[PDB]
Structures are given as structure tokens and as C-alpha cells.
């Protein structure tokens, strides 16, 4: 328990032998983590301060370690005055080590008790002491208090100035004394005075260590106090060009990199021109590398736009793009890539091909040696390749051509990286399939005897880029791929990942071939069901490959054959579920695919029923059955769109691509429903103009591209037939069936969240707990919960809200609609609700927890929690009610 543990620690404290006392004291922070109760924390820290006051210096050192480790629990100290009062008493001890530990203690407590003026006085008096340990402890405490108190900072800046300018202060103490000044960012005149002092420091103490420390802390101070940033930048550039020392230049580079990383927008054209002049002028390749890293960092941001045709930056980047050193070349060509993708002037057209051939040279240079630095430069160049092919799409054919011509000769690691780059490029534009597919395939043959380590990953990456390149069916090619896998892989994890990529790119026949091969070699039954279900889904999607335009009987046959294997697969996948990792997204995604294919089958059946069931003698109306079943299909497709929507909303942990894929499923459902409506049900009042800016339809994948193309074709076909015909004509049937067939022809593309869960999160949702309550004494409920996280919390989406919605019902209607949005503030939210149960029956309480992310999107993710509350009146109130009821 809490008290028991504290008592045990106090027993260890009183032990009087130093070993047990130190053991107990250093055992204190683990107790704080175990039981963060403020009464316990306050009493425990009081005991710690008391043993600190009376106890040898090693015990005090252990207490200092505790206070440094338990900085967060200091906020939960109530008796601050007593605690500090007994800590502070040992500053009067004549023992300088005890004074030093006390000063460090006050420095550790600067957060909770700043503006304690006697402590300030102790720092100030101990600053000019004689013992070296006491002076260092005073310096450390001064740093902490200057970080906390504005009054202390302004009081101590003058003392520090006269201490540096003092002559009895040795050089090393001056060195430790300077970076107190980085904490003078509380005030403008304070910062200006500190800046004046630092200028005096660099001019009067020009040693390498002292100029380094002074101009680095001046950089940090100007970084915090934003007014001094431009003069800091110009001072750093001036020191970079003028000061001959390599250490000073290296510091100027590193801290200018810091400034460019935090406030790139404040950089002026003059500063960038000065830095470019420095880079051109220097003969040292390490310095050139450093300031070119600074230039690349600036060029990534908007500073280049502020910088602006030909200029010293452009001359620099062209000159350094072909440098002998690889790092300078990598940074220079990154600068070229950023400038090329930023602006669209007419001189830049000559610059782009310079950049392209620079990237070419980097591929020839960095693709052989296999050094880690070569991997870094190759990654820089390939990321640049991806960037300028995405940003300047008219320049991608040459990019892919040099990637193809180089993929033959590069080493295995370079092959992996170039395959990743090529896969990105191919995903961003589809007009280069069959040719480059054949070249990567003839490359695929020679992968069976490359190496032993990178062979598997190279196979995965090469098969991935093969699938991205491909957009059709392949049989002898799939035979070659399968033969390669059986011959050289014999692993399965490579086969499983390759099959995963095949499912992702929609190549489902060969994915079925691989998944079927993996059933035998798995060991657990859950994974056996999962792999079997993937085999059935892949086979079911390949059943739709045999569709044909304007052949609706074949469409019905193919959809039925697809649905059979889909049903077998969903049964198997539901068998794959387990308490741990329950396949919720996979179950619901496949079930919505089930319902979508069944809706398509029903719609095609009804469209054929237009002629397979002519209307009766009834003199819309006169087509009663076909109109009613059109209406039912409309309701079904709208419900399907709604279910895709709440599946989206329940997918809080999914990546952006999976959410876009689900969004595309929802949009296909909405497209079919709207086509039904505007062709059959309400053509007159659906006078909508499809005036959407389709030019900016940035498709993120070939699958999404086909989705938008088929949406656009169906919508314009519907628009061309708004009011032309009577709403039960065979042309309406042809339009709807062609929409269904075209929608199904583009194969399904499973995504990452289906196969791979990242950024998991959940809510425990504890609350006050067949519960009776007096009707008059309305219920007061406490609801609280913690947000769990798998690895990093904020990977994709950031959570700052919990929109807890709670309702009620009787005879387990909706009497207690109420909600509260609470920021957790420590990954733990807590709030209360008041609930009325004036009805003397039994009320069921349903409490939900939706989440509003940073952008304002609400995700129904939290658990659905239900309890039953019995409501009743006391017998005296019941009795007076009975007497008063008549």
C-alpha cells in the first residue's frame, strides 16, 4: 500500500547505518511512481527534507538525486514553506560541500519555489565564495532560478557581468558562468543588456572556448527572444566568414543551422547571399558541407521564395552539384531540387535538366560502395528524385529511364532503395506500365543468386514495383515469379509480404497463388484461418476480373462466383478473431464489401427484371414493381454509404491511404444511389450541375485514379440523361448496369490498416458502478478514463478531446441527452454527470466516448458502456404519494 511503503522507508531512514538510509532515500521516487497521492508525496518530502537537514553529505546527495528525479511530483507539495525552510537551514553550515548540496537542492526546487528571496540571496552570496564546489553549485542554482524568476534574472545579470569582467574569476569559471545568460529572455531591455554583455565578451575574451560558449549562448538567447534574431544571424555569418578558426566556423554553421531550423522565415536575402558567398569562398570541404547543409535546410522552407533568376545561390548549387565529395554533391542537388520545385520562371527550364543529370551522377556515384554514408547520400538523392518527379511531372520519363538503366548494375542495398523510389514514382503516374514492367521482370530473373542477406528484402521491393508497374493479368510472368519464390525464397515471410503487396496493388490472382502456398507452413490456427481467408478474398476478387462490358448475364455469373468465395472467406476470417488483436476493421470492411456486392447483384437482377416482369394492367406509377424495387435499392445503397461512413469514423488508428480507400468505397455507393435517384426516382428535381474542379483531382494511387475516372464517367453519363427519357426505359437499365460493371472492373485494393495496425489507442472508461437510487436524490456520476497507446501516441492523428455522450432509456426514452468535451491534460480525463430518474422504474445508462482530433474531426472510437440503474422512492414518499394520488 501507500502508507505501509512510506512507513517501511521511514524505518529504513531511522536505521542510523548509512547503507540502509541511502537505500531508503533512493527508494523514495519509485514509491512516488507507485502511489502519486499528494498527501503521501507531501509527507514523504517532509521526511526527506528532515533527513536532509540532519544527516551526512552523502545522504544529502542521495536526497538531491531524488529531488532531481522527482521533479514532477514537486508540484504536489503543499507544505512548501516548511519543506524549503528545513532544506534551507543547512546553507548556514560552515561545510562547503553541505552548502553546495543545498544550492543544488534549491536549484532543483526552482520550479516550485521561485521568487523566494532568501534563496536568491543565498545564490548571490554563494556565487562569490571561495570553495570551488560551492561556486559551481551556486552557478547551477543561478541557471535554474534565472530560468524561473524574472526578478532573479534581472538581479543576477549585473552580478554575472561584473563577475566575468572581474579578474579574480578564472577562465573555466567564466566559461561556466557565461551560459546563465541564455535565460535572460524574460524582457526586452533585459535581453538587450545581455546582448551588449555578450558582444563585450567576444571582443575582450577572444579565446576559442570562450567565443564558442558566448556566441552559442547568444544564439540561444536570440532564439528565445525573437527580436534579436536578425542581428544574431548577421553576427554568425560575419564570424563564419571572418574568424579563421575551424572550431568557430563549425559553431557558426551548427547554430545557424539551428536558427534556420526554427525561424527560416526571418532569414533575409542578404543573409542567404552572405552565406552563399561564404560557401563559394571556403576551401575546406567540411565547412562547405556544413553551410551547404544550412542552405539545403533553408531551401526546404519558404526562405528561397523570400530570396527571390541566376544568382550566387544558383551558381553555388550548380557548382557543388558535381562536387567530388558525395555529401556536398547531395546537398547541392537537394538545393537544386528545392529551387526547381519551388518556382516556375522561364530560366528555371534550363535548370531542371541540370538537376536531373545531377541526380543521375549521384546514382552512378553512390550505388556501388555500400558504405553507410553512401546510403545516406543515396537516400538524399532518391528523395530528391521522388520530389522533382512529383512536383514537375513532365520530367518523370527521364527519371524512370535512368533508374531502369542503373538498376542493372547497382548493388543490392542500392537496388532496394531505387526500387522504393521507382515504386513511389510509378504510384504517382500510370502511363509507363508494360515496358518498364518487362525490364524489371528481366531483372527479376537474376535475383535468385545475388546474396544471402538483402536478397529477401530485394525480392519484396522488386515484386512490389512489379505489381505497381502492372495493370493487367499475367500468367507466364506469374509462373516465373512463383518459380523464383519456390526456388530461392523457401521462407514464406517474403512470400507473405509479396502477397500483401499483390493484394494492395490489386493483383489478386497471383496473390491467391501465394496465399494458398502459405497455409501448410503456418503454425497457429488463427493465422491459418487468416491466411485462408486472404486466399478466399483474393480468389473472390479475381472472379470479378472476368467481367465484360455490356454483358450483364456474365456480370451476374461473375458476381455470384465472387460472392461464394467472399462468404467462405468472411466465415474463415471471423474464425481468425481472438481476444488479443480482434480483426474488427477486417471483419467490418469485408462485410461491407459483402453487402456492396450483394447490392450490385440485386440491382443487376432488378435491371433485368425490368424486362423479366412487365407491368400489370394499371392504367413512378404504371411501373409499380420496378419502381418499388428501385426505391429499395436506393435505400440499400444509402444505408451502405452510411455504414462505410461509420466504418471510417471507427477507423481512428488507420493511415490516410486506408481512410481514402474506405472513402472511395463510400463514394461508389453514393454514386450508384444518386444515379438510381436521378435516372428513375426524382429526375425532375435533381437539376444539379457537376461543376467540380476536376483538374485538381490529385490521385494518390493508380487504384484511386481509376476510381475517380469511373466516377466521372458515370456522373457525366447520368448528366447526359437527366430528362431525356421516361424513367423506366432500357437506357436507364443500361446506364446503371454499365456503372456497376465499370465500378467492379477496377479491382479492390486492400490497404495497410487491413494488414498492419499502427498507432493503437483505447479507453478504459472507469465510472461509478442492478444499482438502486432514491428518485429524489438524482444520480451523481463520475466518469474517468485513460487513453492507451501502442508505441508513440501521436503517430497519425493527435487526440485532444473526448466528447463523452451519455443517454438513458426506460424498461431495459432518451431522457438524459447530455455530453461533455474534456481535454485529458495528462492522458487521463475525469468529469461528472448528473442524471435524473424521476420515473420510478429501471433505467439503463449508455455512455459513449467520441474523440475530436486537432483538426476537429470526430471519431466514434471509444467503447460503448452500459449499466442498469434501479430507480425507486422511499416508502414514506411512496406512501404519501398513494394517500395524495386519490
Amino acid at each position: 500500500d501507500a502508507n505501509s511503503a512510506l512507513m517501511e522507508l521511514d524505518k529504513g531512514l531511522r536505521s542510523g547505518k548509512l547503507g540502509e538510509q541511502c537505500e531508503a532515500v533512493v527508494r523514495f521516487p519509485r514509491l512516488f511512481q507507485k502511489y502519486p497521492f499528494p498527501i503521501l508525496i507531501n509527507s514523504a518530502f517532509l521526511k526527506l527534507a528532515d533527513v536532509f537537514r540532519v544527516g551526512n553529505n552523502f545522504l544529502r546527495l542521495c536526497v538531491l538525486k531524488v529531488t532531481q528525479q522527482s521533479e514532477k511530483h514537486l508540484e504536489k507539495i503543499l507544505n512548501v514553506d516548511e519543506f524549503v525552510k528545513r532544506i534551507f537551514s543547512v546553507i548556514h553550515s560552515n561545510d562547503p560541500v553541505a552548502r553546495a548540496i543545498t544550492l543544488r537542492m534549491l536549484g532543483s526546487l526552482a520550479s516550485i519555489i521561485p521568487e523566494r528571496k532568501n534563496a536568491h540571496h543565498s545564490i548571490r552570496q554563494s556565487l562569490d565564495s571561495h570553495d570551488n564546489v560551492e561556486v559551481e553549485a551556486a552557478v547551477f542554482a543561478a541557471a535554474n532560478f534565472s530560468a524561473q524568476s524574472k526578478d532573479f534574472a534581472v538581479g543576477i545579470c549585473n552580478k554575472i557581468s561584473e563577475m566575468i569582467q572581474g579578474l579574480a574569476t578564472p577562465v573555466d569559471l567564466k566559461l561556466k558562468l557565461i551560459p546563465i545568460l541564455q535565460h535572460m529572455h524574460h524582457d526586452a531591455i533585459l535581453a538587450s543588456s545581455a546582448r551588449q554583455l555578450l558582444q563585450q565578451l567576444v571582443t575582450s575574451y577572444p579565446s576559442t572556448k570562450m567565443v564558442i560558449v558566448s556566441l552559442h549562448t547568444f544564439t540561444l538567447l536570440a532564439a528565445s527572444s525573437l527580436v534579436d534574431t536578425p542581428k544574431q544571424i548577421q553576427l554568425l555569418l560575419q564570424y563564419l566568414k571572418n574568424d579563421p578558426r575551424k572550431a568557430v566556423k563549425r559553431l557558426a554553421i551548427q547554430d545557424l543551422k539551428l536558427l534556420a531550423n526554427k525561424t527560416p522565415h526571418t532569414w533575409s536575402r542578404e543573409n542567404i547571399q552572405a552565406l552563399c558567398e561564404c560557401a563559394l569562398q571556403t576551401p575546406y570541404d567540411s565547412l562547405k558541407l556544413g553551410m551547404l547543409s544550412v542552405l539545403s535546410t533553408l531551401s526546404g522552407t519558404i526562405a528561397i521564395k523570400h530570396y527571390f533568376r541566376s544568382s550566387d545561390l544558383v551558381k553555388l548549387a550548380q557548382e557543388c552539384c558535381y562536387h567530388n565529395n558525395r555529401g556536398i554533391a547531395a546537398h547541392g542537388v537537394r538545393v537544386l531540387t528545392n529551387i526547381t520545385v519551388s518556382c516556375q520562371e522561364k530560366d528555371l527550364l534550363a535548370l531542371e535538366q541540370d538537376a536531373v543529370f545531377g541526380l543521375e551522377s549521384l546514382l552512378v556515384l553512390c550505388s556501388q560502395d555500400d558504405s553507410p554514408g553512401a546510403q545516406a547520400t543515396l537516400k538524399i538523392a532518391l528523395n530528391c528524385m521522388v520530389k522533382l518527379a512529383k512536383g514537375r511531372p513532365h520530367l518523370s520519363q527521364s527519371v524512370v529511364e535512368t533508374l531502369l538503366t542503373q538498376l542493372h548494375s547497382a548493388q543490392d542495398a542500392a537496388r532496394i532503395l531505387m526500387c522504393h523510389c521507382l515504386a513511389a514514382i510509378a504510384m504517382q503516374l500510370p502511363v509507363l506500365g508494360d515496358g518498364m514492367l518487362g525490364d524489371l521482370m528481366e531483372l527479376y530473373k537474376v535475383i535468385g543468386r545475388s546474396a544471402t542477406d538483402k536478397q529477401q528484402e530485394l525480392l519484396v521491393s522488386l515484386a512490389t514495383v512489379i505489381f505497381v508497374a502492372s495493370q493487367k493479368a499475367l500468367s507466364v510472368e506469374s509462373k516465373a515469379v512463383i518459380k523464383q519464390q519456390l526456388e530461392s525464397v523457401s521462407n514464406g515471410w517474403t512470400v507473405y509480404r509479396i502477397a500483401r503487396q499483390a493484394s494492395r496493388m490489386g493483383n489478386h490472382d497471383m496473390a491467391k497463388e501465394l496465399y494458398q502456398s502459405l497455409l501448410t507452413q503456418v503454425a497457429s490456427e488463427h493465422f491459418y484461418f487468416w491466411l485462408n481467408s486472404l486466399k478466399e478474398f483474393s480468389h473472390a476478387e479475381q472472379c470479378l476480373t472476368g467481367l465484360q462490358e455490356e454483358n450483364y448475364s456474365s456480370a451476374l455469373s461473375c458476381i455470384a462466383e465472387s460472392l461464394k468465395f467472399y462468404h467462405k472467406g468472411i466465415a474463415s476470417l471471423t474464425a481468425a478473431s481472438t481476444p488479443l488483436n480482434p480483426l474488427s476493421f477486417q471483419c467490418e470492411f469485408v462485410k461491407l464489401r459483402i453487402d456492396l456486392l450483394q447490392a450490385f447483384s440485386q440491382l443487376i437482377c432488378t435491371c433485368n427484371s425490368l424486362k423479366t416482369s412487365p407491368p400489370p394492367a394499371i392504367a413512378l406509377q404504371r411501373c409499380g414493381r420496378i419502381s418499388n424495387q428501385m426505391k429499395q435499392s436506393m435505400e440499400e445503397f444509402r444505408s451502405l454509404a452510411s455504414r462505410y461512413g461509420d466504418l471510417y469514423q471507427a477507423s481512428f488508428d488507420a493511415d490516410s491511404a486506408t481512410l481514402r480507400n474506405v472513402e472511395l468505397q463510400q463514394q461508389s455507393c453514393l454514386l450508384i444511389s444518386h444515379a438510381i435517384e436521378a435516372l428513375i426516382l426524382d429526375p425532375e428535381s435533381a437539376s444539379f450541375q457537376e461543376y467540380g474542379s476536376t483538374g485538381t483531382a490529385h490521385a494518390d494511387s493508380e487504384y484511386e485514379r481509376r476510381m475517380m475516372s469511373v466516377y466521372n464517367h458515370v456522373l457525366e453519363e447520368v448528366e447526359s440523361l437527366n430528362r431525356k427519357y421516361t424513367p423506366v426505359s432500357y437506357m436507364h437499365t443500361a446506364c446503371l448496369c454499365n456503372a456497376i460493371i465499370a465500378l467492379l472492373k477496377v479491382p479492390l485494393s486492400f490497404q495497410r490498416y487491413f494488414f498492419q495496425k499502427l498507432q493503437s489507442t483505447s479507453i478504459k472508461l472507469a465510472l461509478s458502478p442492478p444499482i438502486a437510487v432514491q428518485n429524489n436524490q438524482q444520480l451523481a456520476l463520475k466518469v474517468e478514463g485513460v487513453v492507451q497507446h501502442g508505441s508513440k501516441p501521436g503517430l497519425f492523428r493527435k487526440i485532444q478531446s473526448v466528447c463523452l455522450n451519455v443517454s438513458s432509456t426506460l424498461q431495459s426514452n432518451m431522457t438524459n441527452e447530455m455530453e461533455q468535451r474534456v481535454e485529458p491534460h495528462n492522458d487521463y480525463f475525469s468529469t461528472q454527470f448528473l442524471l435524473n430518474f424521476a420515473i420510478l422504474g429501471t433505467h439503463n445508462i449508455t455512455v459513449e466516448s467520441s474523440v475530436k482530433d486537432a483538426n476537429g474531426i470526430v471519431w466514434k472510437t471509444g467503447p460503448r458502456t452500459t449499466i442498469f440503474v434501479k430507480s425507486l422512492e422511499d416508502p414514506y414518499s411512496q406512501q404519501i404519494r398513494l394517500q395524495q394520488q386519490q
Binding site: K379, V386, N491, G492, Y496, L518, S524, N581, R752
Partner: peptide
């Protein structure tokens, strides 16, 4: 840090429990 293919499925070296368990059970 720097990545070539921003959307890459093989990026995650240490995977979730499902993929870790599936990997160990098939890397042999």
C-alpha cells in the same frame, strides 16, 4: 528521419503483435 517512399509498408521494423507473431511463426 529521411525516407524514400513516404508510404512504405516495410518501413516499420518492429511491428505490432499480430505481425510480430506472424513473422516469428513464418521466418523458418
Amino acid at each position: 528521419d529521411v525516407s524514400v517512399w513516404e508510404e512504405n509498408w516495410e518501413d516499420d521494423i518492429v511491428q505490432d503483435d499480430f505481425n510480430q507473431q506472424l513473422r516469428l511463426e513464418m521466418f523458418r
